[PDB]
Amino acid sequence: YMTPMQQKLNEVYEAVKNYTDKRGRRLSAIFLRLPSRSELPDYYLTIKKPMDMEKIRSHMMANKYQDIDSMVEDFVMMFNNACTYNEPESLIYKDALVLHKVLLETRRDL
Numbered sequence: 135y136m137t138p139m140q141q142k143l144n145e146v147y148e149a150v151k152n153y154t155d156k157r158g159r160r161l162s163a164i165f166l167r168l169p170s171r172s173e174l175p176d177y178y179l180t181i182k183k184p185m186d187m188e189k190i191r192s193h194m195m196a197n198k199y200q201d202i203d204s205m206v207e208d209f210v211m212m213f214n215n216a217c218t219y220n221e222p223e224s225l226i227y228k229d230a231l232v233l234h235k236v237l238l239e240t241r242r243d244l
């Protein structure tokens with residue numbers, strides 16, 4: 135069984151994962167797993183602390199987050215990373231902005 139804190143962390147995680155735009159697209163999809171270092175080596179020269187949602191979920195399911203802010207900080211790092219690597223005109227950049235706002239609104243509601 136999972137702790138109440140794990141259940142709250144999961145509610146925040148699922149809110150980001152499952153958010154859909156007006157067309158029904160989950161903006162989380164590209165963030166679930168980073169490209170490999172072999173695939174995209176220059177990402178890892180620009181981004182000093184890589185993060186994706188696979189990492190966050192396994193940490194949460196390993197009962198390692200002591201509170202909600204610790205998870206939020208990892209999401210914020212991931213979205214900051216996406217917006218550092220990609221240009222502001224790009225779709226991934228814009229998706230990261232929206233999901234960062236979704237994250238904060240979810241934390242406020244909970």
Ligand SMILES: Nc1nnc(-c2ccccc2O)cc1N1CC[NH2+]CC1
Pocket residue numbers: 164165166167168169174185186187212215216217219220226
């Ligand atoms: N351009 C990209 N930027 N960022 C990510 C990315 C993925 C997960 C977590 C954080 C991230 O920043 C992925 C990207 N692409 C995937 C598709 N193939 C081209 C590279």
